[PDB]
Amino acid sequence: LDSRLPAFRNLSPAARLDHIGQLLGLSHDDVSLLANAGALPMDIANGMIENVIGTFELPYAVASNFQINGRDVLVPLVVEEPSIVAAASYMAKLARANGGFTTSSSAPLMHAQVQIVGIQDPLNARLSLLRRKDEIIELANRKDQLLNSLGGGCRDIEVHTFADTPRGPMLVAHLIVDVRDAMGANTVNTMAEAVAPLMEAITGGQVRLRILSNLADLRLARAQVRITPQQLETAEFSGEAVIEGILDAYAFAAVDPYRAATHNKGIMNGIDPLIVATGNDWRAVEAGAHAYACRSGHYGSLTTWEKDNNGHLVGTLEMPMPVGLVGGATKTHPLAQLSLRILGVKTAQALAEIAVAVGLAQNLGAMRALATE
Amino acid sequence: LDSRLPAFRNLSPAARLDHIGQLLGLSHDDVSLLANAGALPMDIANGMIENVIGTFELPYAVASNFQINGRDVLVPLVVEEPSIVAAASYMAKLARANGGFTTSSSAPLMHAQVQIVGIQDPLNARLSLLRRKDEIIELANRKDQLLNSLGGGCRDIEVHTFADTPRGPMLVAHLIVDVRDAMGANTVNTMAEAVAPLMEAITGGQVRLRILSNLADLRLARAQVRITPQQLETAEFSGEAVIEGILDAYAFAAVDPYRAATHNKGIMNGIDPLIVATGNDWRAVEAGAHAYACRSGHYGSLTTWEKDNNGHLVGTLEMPMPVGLVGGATKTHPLAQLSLRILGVKTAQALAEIAVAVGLAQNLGAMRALATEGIQ
Ligand SMILES: C[C@@](O)(CCS)CC(=O)O
Ligand SMILES: C[C@@](O)(CCS)CC(=O)O
């Protein structure tokens, strides 16, 4: 695949679609899903959420130029705000000259929290749970034998205590679960329910909340980009000056939460539209992103920007990225399925890696604009 | 208006739309917007964002039972996830018995940041700016006198310094701007560009970034809700026990960021779909929400939950809520316009107040469900 698409921004929607269809070898019927309104039929919409009276459209666009680990990728995006798609495509174009985006990710690990109350000895109870961790993990896995056959499953437990809260002592167990190609909520919640009676028997306490954590800090996706001074030169500014300007902008975000919020918002401008396009839960991605940004006790920037030993601008984005190819609405929405086909992703972590690449590209575009104005 | 909508959940989408139309007295044109697919014309969609190849639908629903400061309101919501609309509606139903939701909000005040570098004396330059505050404010208000006449405009400036960063000393001025019915990005960005040469002249430094802050902590919206033990009783638990369970869940969110992230995610399950339904920018609302949640140096719960002196469960939500009735897709999307018609909102702050009421209801619904689920 070649993702460049010259003159794409100036073609009509119909011509853009026909071009995409030809590039990907989409069927006439697949193309029909975008060529005509109503790809989400009312019986599907009515079964997705409650009190439905119709559907609501946002534009469906494709960003060009993206290249991930040497392979060109076309990126569908659904959003209402101008400039996002153009900035994504243009920054991807610059990235291409220097090898594109380089990405990696952790295993798709999610936390299931099991909150325990009603015991006077939470610190002791924690050791009781750890002593019997194998038994707990085995019980969790008995509950989802298919997942284990697919290469996922409960891998570990960790246990945290809050001995002094205004509501008394609490213990919180985390199941650490490989969820393969799911976002993971229903998967881990089910395991949390399954282990609850055993945890009560072990601790002598009362289980309260059984629920995933959206602070998915064991499910990280990583992206790198490199830009040379030559690429950033303007009529007004030399490329070296622009790079220094960008580093100044980054330092500003790193110290001032008023700037970091806006800086990170820019990243999410790139990410959320891909989440929507793939039928994924954007609230979950947002919560993981912003909570991770303040894990140090200070709300800072999700990206980093530096100058390497060669004087080149180098950027990173590492953040939680819980997304699915299966589960939720990723299967139910015919256009979510088409998006996955366009992307060509075969695992959820592959989708996660594309997400962070697009987030990094958007942040680069935002700061290049702010540093050159 | 009566927002109770009996049996709404079980009616057909067509019958639901008819009942809404009757209640609001919607025109034929308005009803036809939702009855046929493709309400967003491709010409409009193509002008909204770049590289458009089609459109993407999400379900469009209406939450029932909401009441804001004694007035019933219907709430449109666009989202993919089940249980949200039902939970919102059911919690709103319970809220009604005790006076519904009570809301307030600050003026629609947004920050424009002006970053200045390369000053050898940033602390001194800060005082130079403050001495000439009125002069700066006057210049900011020069271009848009329509905004001033509508009761908006630059109200104040604050100046902050970061004298020791790895890239040298930085001075950051904030223009504090009343943006009336806009989210405010265009308004404040324009003012920030306008005052920049004057700030350079005063400080002797170089202006770099001129940009709104999404941490809109001067644009707060507030909601309150009250629920009695009687309303929360289940087959297994007394209402009193359920209230204690909810308070335990709240304390858990207040101490553990792994819980707080999920707890706040639930709030945003309520809010974001209303933001989408009104053509507004949900990334802006998300960033303001979560950054505000950590302002104290610990990422905590946006809501609060307490038991009052009568033993009633009382909840609050106060958070940044920058939204518009004008600008971009809010204007150009026919269904964003329909959503505003359904809501009946006359100011952006009124929309903000409904947003926090829905966020508060959603959090309550989530905690109630988690607190009442039996151990298997
Ligand atoms: C340009 C930006 O505000 C997003 C526009 S909605 C992000 C940033 O400031 O870095
Ligand atoms: C139930 C909840 O996870 C949202 C479902 S997406 C929120 C919460 O845990 O309070």
From Swiss-Prot, chain A:
Pfam families: HMG-CoA_red. It catalyses: (R)-mevalonate + 2 NAD(+) + CoA = (3S)-3-hydroxy-3-methylglutaryl-CoA + 2 NADH + 2 H(+). It is an enzyme of class 1 (oxidoreductase). Pathway: Metabolic intermediate metabolism; (R)-mevalonate degradation; (S)-3-hydroxy-3-methylglutaryl-CoA from (R)-mevalonate: step 1/1. Disulfide bonds: none annotated. CDD domains: HMG-CoA_reductase_classII. The keyword Oxidoreductase applies. GO terms for molecular function: hydroxymethylglutaryl-CoA reductase (NADH) activity; hydroxymethylglutaryl-CoA reductase (NADPH) activity. The active site is at residues 81, 265, 281. GO terms for biological process: coenzyme A metabolic process. Induction: Coinduction with mevalonate transport system. Homotetramer. Belongs to the HMG-CoA reductase family. This is 3-hydroxy-3-methylglutaryl-coenzyme A reductase. The lineage of its organism: Bacteria, Pseudomonadati, Pseudomonadota, Gammaproteobacteria, Pseudomonadales.
Swiss-Prot record, chain B:
Disulfide bonds: none annotated. Keywords: NAD, Oxidoreductase. One of its GO terms (molecular function) is hydroxymethylglutaryl-CoA reductase (NADH) activity. GO terms for biological process: coenzyme A metabolic process. It comes from the Bacteria. Induction: Coinduction with mevalonate transport system. Homotetramer. The gene is mvaA. Pathway: Metabolic intermediate metabolism; (R)-mevalonate degradation; (S)-3-hydroxy-3-methylglutaryl-CoA from (R)-mevalonate: step 1/1. It catalyses: (R)-mevalonate + 2 NAD(+) + CoA = (3S)-3-hydroxy-3-methylglutaryl-CoA + 2 NADH + 2 H(+). P.mevalonii can use mevalonate as sole carbon source. With this enzyme mevalonate is deacetylated to HMG-CoA. This is 3-hydroxy-3-methylglutaryl-coenzyme A reductase. The active site is at residues 81, 265, 281. NCBIfam families: HMG_CoA_R_NAD (TIGR00532). InterPro entries: HMG_CoA_Rdtase, HMG_CoA_Rdtase_bac-typ, HMG_CoA_Rdtase_cat_sf, HMG_CoA_Rdtase_CS, HMG_CoA_Rdtase_NAD(P)-bd_sf, HMG_CoA_Rdtase_sub-bd_dom_sf. It comes from Pseudomonas mevalonii. Belongs to the HMG-CoA reductase family. Its EC number is 1.1.1.88. The lineage of its organism: Bacteria, Pseudomonadati, Pseudomonadota, Gammaproteobacteria, Pseudomonadales. Transmembrane segments: none annotated.
